[PDB]
Design a protein around this motif. Structure first.
Motif, PDB file in Angstrom:
ATOM      1  N   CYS A   1       0.892  -1.292  -0.305  1.00 46.15           N
ATOM      2  CA  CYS A   1       0.061  -0.133  -0.086  1.00 46.15           C
ATOM      3  C   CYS A   1       0.811   1.361  -0.020  1.00 46.15           C
ATOM      4  CB  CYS A   1      -0.658  -0.096   1.226  1.00 46.15           C
ATOM      5  SG  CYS A   1      -2.240  -1.275   1.442  1.00 46.15           S
ATOM      6  N   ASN A   2       2.113   0.987   0.505  1.00 43.15           N
ATOM      7  CA  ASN A   2       2.886   2.327   0.630  1.00 43.15           C
ATOM      8  C   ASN A   2       3.906   2.519  -0.884  1.00 43.15           C
ATOM      9  OD1 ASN A   2       2.134   3.136   3.288  1.00 43.15           O
ATOM     10  ND2 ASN A   2       3.321   0.982   3.734  1.00 43.15           N
ATOM     11  N   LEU A   3       3.739   1.686  -1.885  1.00 37.57           N
ATOM     12  CA  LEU A   3       4.352   1.645  -3.070  1.00 37.57           C
ATOM     13  C   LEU A   3       3.990   2.992  -3.666  1.00 37.57           C
ATOM     14  CD1 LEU A   3       4.459  -1.841  -3.872  1.00 37.57           C
ATOM     15  CD2 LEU A   3       6.587  -0.590  -3.027  1.00 37.57           C
ATOM     16  N   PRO A   4       4.428   3.755  -4.536  1.00 37.06           N
ATOM     17  CA  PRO A   4       3.972   4.676  -5.452  1.00 37.06           C
ATOM     18  C   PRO A   4       3.398   4.139  -6.627  1.00 37.06           C
ATOM     19  CG  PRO A   4       6.388   4.354  -5.894  1.00 37.06           C
ATOM     20  CD  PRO A   4       6.121   3.495  -4.937  1.00 37.06           C
ATOM     21  N   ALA A   5       2.212   4.911  -7.012  1.00 30.58           N
ATOM     22  CA  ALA A   5       1.460   4.499  -8.317  1.00 30.58           C
ATOM     23  C   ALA A   5       2.427   4.553  -9.501  1.00 30.58           C
ATOM     24  CB  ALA A   5       0.667   5.654  -8.784  1.00 30.58           C
ATOM     25  N   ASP A   6       2.601   3.425 -10.113  1.00 27.34           N
ATOM     26  CA  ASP A   6       3.159   2.729 -11.162  1.00 27.34           C
ATOM     27  C   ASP A   6       2.334   2.692 -12.683  1.00 27.34           C
ATOM     28  OD1 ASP A   6       4.833   1.643 -12.935  1.00 27.34           O
ATOM     29  OD2 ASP A   6       5.798   0.400 -11.360  1.00 27.34           O
ATOM     30  N   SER A   7       2.387   3.552 -13.299  1.00 25.62           N
ATOM     31  CA  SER A   7       1.685   3.364 -14.584  1.00 25.62           C
ATOM     32  C   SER A   7       1.881   2.127 -15.545  1.00 25.62           C
ATOM     33  CB  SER A   7       1.828   4.654 -15.476  1.00 25.62           C
ATOM     34  OG  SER A   7       1.215   5.879 -14.719  1.00 25.62           O
ATOM     35  N   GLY A   8       3.171   1.594 -15.231  1.00 27.54           N
ATOM     36  CA  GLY A   8       3.566   0.402 -15.947  1.00 27.54           C
ATOM     37  C   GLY A   8       3.864   0.561 -17.544  1.00 27.54           C
ATOM     38  N   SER A   9       3.437  -0.348 -18.412  1.00 32.09           N
ATOM     39  CA  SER A   9       3.753  -0.282 -19.918  1.00 32.09           C
ATOM     40  C   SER A   9       2.500  -0.746 -20.680  1.00 32.09           C
ATOM     41  CB  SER A   9       4.943  -1.187 -20.061  1.00 32.09           C
ATOM     42  OG  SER A   9       6.331  -0.856 -19.697  1.00 32.09           O
ATOM     43  N   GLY A  10       2.699  -0.019 -21.992  1.00 31.86           N
ATOM     44  CA  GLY A  10       1.430  -0.721 -22.747  1.00 31.86           C
ATOM     45  C   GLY A  10       0.736   0.602 -23.352  1.00 31.86           C
ATOM     46  N   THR A  11      -0.155   0.155 -24.314  1.00 34.10           N
ATOM     47  CA  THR A  11      -0.889   1.272 -24.960  1.00 34.10           C
ATOM     48  C   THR A  11      -2.321   1.391 -24.821  1.00 34.10           C
ATOM     49  OG1 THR A  11      -1.295  -0.220 -26.972  1.00 34.10           O
ATOM     50  CG2 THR A  11       0.752   1.466 -26.982  1.00 34.10           C
ATOM     51  N   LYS A  12      -2.977   0.583 -23.988  1.00 37.79           N
ATOM     52  CA  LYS A  12      -4.244   0.744 -23.454  1.00 37.79           C
ATOM     53  C   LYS A  12      -4.301   1.057 -22.269  1.00 37.79           C
ATOM     54  N   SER A  13      -4.381   2.726 -22.274  1.00 34.59           N
ATOM     55  CA  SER A  13      -4.601   3.464 -21.025  1.00 34.59           C
ATOM     56  C   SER A  13      -5.848   3.110 -20.442  1.00 34.59           C
ATOM     57  CB  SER A  13      -4.360   5.010 -21.078  1.00 34.59           C
ATOM     58  OG  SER A  13      -5.414   5.445 -22.119  1.00 34.59           O
ATOM     59  N   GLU A  14      -5.945   3.091 -19.129  1.00 26.07           N
ATOM     60  CA  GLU A  14      -7.012   2.608 -18.259  1.00 26.07           C
ATOM     61  C   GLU A  14      -6.854   3.055 -16.927  1.00 26.07           C
ATOM     62  OE1 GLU A  14      -8.542  -1.504 -16.291  1.00 26.07           O
ATOM     63  OE2 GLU A  14      -7.288  -1.516 -17.945  1.00 26.07           O
ATOM     64  N   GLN A  15      -8.010   3.767 -16.314  1.00 26.38           N
ATOM     65  CA  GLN A  15      -8.009   4.347 -15.065  1.00 26.38           C
ATOM     66  C   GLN A  15      -7.883   3.095 -14.048  1.00 26.38           C
ATOM     67  OE1 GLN A  15     -10.213   8.098 -13.589  1.00 26.38           O
ATOM     68  NE2 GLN A  15     -11.293   6.691 -12.059  1.00 26.38           N
ATOM     69  N   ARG A  16      -7.122   3.524 -12.913  1.00 23.48           N
ATOM     70  CA  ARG A  16      -7.070   2.453 -12.001  1.00 23.48           C
ATOM     71  C   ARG A  16      -7.001   3.469 -10.571  1.00 23.48           C
ATOM     72  NH1 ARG A  16      -5.310  -2.653 -13.428  1.00 23.48           N
ATOM     73  NH2 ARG A  16      -6.380  -3.150 -15.080  1.00 23.48           N
ATOM     74  N   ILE A  17      -7.269   3.037  -9.521  1.00 25.23           N
ATOM     75  CA  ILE A  17      -7.050   3.620  -8.142  1.00 25.23           C
ATOM     76  C   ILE A  17      -5.687   3.056  -7.247  1.00 25.23           C
ATOM     77  CG2 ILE A  17      -8.358   4.075  -6.183  1.00 25.23           C
ATOM     78  CD1 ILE A  17      -9.372   5.013  -8.654  1.00 25.23           C
TER      79      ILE A  17
END
Length: 60
Positions: A6-22
């Motif tokens: 829970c204390n890790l930063p948000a990580d947008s990862g890789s890929g081309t299909k952008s998608e909202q997460r929480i």
């Protein structure tokens, strides 16, 4: 207790299909939106706000 991831930063990862997460923002103690590229990233990545809230913000 709060899972450590829970204390890790948000990580947008890789890929081309952008998608909202929480993700749980440990500094603000809030579940906030971020853009997830579809692959990779870390475990602080939730489909719905309630998931983040029950898992990280107010953990069992």
């Amino acid at each position: 207790d709060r899972p450590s991831y829970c204390n890790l930063p948000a990580d947008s990862g890789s890929g081309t299909k952008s998608e909202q997460r929480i993700y749980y923002n440990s500094a603000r103690k809030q579940c906030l939106t971020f853009t997830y590229n579809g692959k990779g990233g870390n475990e602080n990545n939730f489909i719905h706000t309630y998931d983040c809230a029950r898992t990280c913000q107010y953990p069992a």
